């Protein structure tokens, strides 16, 4: 019996007063065979507008619903994610604004929330193939809150346009309370994924169904129609980012 640890020697983030029990290591983080299944749908533009932070503009009244399989992620492990991203323009720059995310592994949850500010919660996303269908099921406790399907790699999709999309900035609200119940941190962060390879990309018919849940209200962003269906597989790196706005300043 032994641990290689011992003890606050591994101070991954260079804290003057470090915490003995670590939850996540430092990055950057390498992703091999990071596999995206995205169903973009039109919704009510007002619901979306109401959610965006100051000076951020909606590129279109669309939610991008994703399932992401991350079977080999350095530091974070072997897990799956599902969530909702909104296409936006901020200060002249087009990117995405993540409004919901669900993972089945705590290290990337605590890390995602505490480093960049991803709005991550614990749930049970699954991405898998059953015969000729690619399926994503997002379960939250006992309830299936999203079911997406796609015809398996029916047609190819231009991998260069996908790369262009993956290269777009990732905008997040990093909100952390103070121990006294008031705000400590309320920031807009921006992060760019690096060293990306799109190994393959496809399109096909798709479907999405959402169901309500008091603590995962993703169904609030109701589906007017599906505007796009994508499946692609990548290797990429998630590096550190930067604060672009501080609302407490």
> Where in the sequence numbering do the catalytic residues fall?
120
Task: Note whether 179 binds a second copy by CB under 8 A.
Answer: yes
Instruction: Measure Cα distances from 54 to 64, 80, 86, 200, 241 in Å.
Output: 21, 31, 15, 36, 19
Question: Of the candidates 58, 59, 105, 163, which one interacts with a second copy according to CB under 8 A?
Answer: 105
Binding to a second copy by residue 2, rule CB under 8 A?
yes
Q: Please, what is the minimum distance in Å from the beta carbon of residue 1 to a second copy?
A: 4
Of residues 118-157, which lie at the interface with a second copy (CB under 8 A)?
119, 121-122, 129-133, 135, 137, 141-143, 147, 149-156
* Contact flag: residue 92 with a second copy (CB under 8 A): no
Which of 126-161 are b and which e, b meaning 16 or more Cβ less than 10 Å from the residue's Cβ? ebeeeeeebbbbbbbeeeebbebbbbebeeebebee
Strand-strand pairing, 133-140 and 56-58:
unpaired
Options 178, 194, 195, 197; binder of a second copy; rule CB under 8 A: 178
Cα separation, 47 vs 51, whole angstroms: 7
- The token pair at 131 is 């015969």
Closest CB 161 distance from a second copy, rounded Å: 18
Q: Between the CA of residue 145 and those of 123, 209, 221, what are the distances in Å?
A: 10, 8, 12
Q: With CB under 8 A, what is the number of residues at the site for a second copy?
A: 125
Residue 217 interacting with a second copy (CB under 8 A) = yes
Q: Could you tell me the smallest distance in angstroms from the CB atom of residue 163 to a second copy? A: 20
């Amino acid at each position: 019996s032994a641990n290689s640890l011992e003890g606050v020697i591994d101070n991954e983030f260079s804290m003057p007063a470090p915490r003995w029990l670590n939850t996540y290591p430092a990055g950057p983080y390498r992703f091999i065979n990071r596999e995206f299944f995205i169903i973009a749908y039109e919704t009510d533009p007002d619901l979306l507008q109401a959610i965006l932070p100051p000076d951020m503009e909606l590129l279109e009244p669309v939610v991008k619903f994703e399932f992401i399989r991350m079977p080999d992620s350095t530091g974070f492990g072997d897990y799956t994610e599902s969530g909702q991203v909104v296409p936006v323009r901020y200060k002249g720059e087009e990117g995405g604004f993540t409004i919901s995310m669900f993972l089945d592994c705590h290290a990337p949850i605590a890390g995602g929330r505490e480093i960049w500010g991803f709005p991550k919660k614990l749930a049970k996303p699954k991405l898998f193939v059953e015969e000729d269908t690619l399926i994503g099921i997002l379960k939250y406790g006992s309830i299936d809150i999203a079911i997406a399907t796609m015809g398996y790699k029916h047609r190819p999709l231009d991998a260069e346009k996908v790369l262009e999309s993956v290269k777009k900035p990732v905008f997040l609200l990093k909100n952390i309370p103070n121990v006294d119940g008031t705000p400590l941190v309320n920031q807009l962060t921006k992060t760019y994924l690096t060293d990306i390879t799109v190994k393959g990309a496809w399109t096909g018919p798709g479907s999405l169904e959402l169901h309500p849940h008091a603590l995962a209200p993703i169904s609030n962003l109701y589906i007017k129609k599906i505007v796009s269906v994508s499946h692609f597989i990548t290797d990429l790196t998630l590096p550190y980012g930067k604060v672009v706005a501080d609302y407490l300043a």
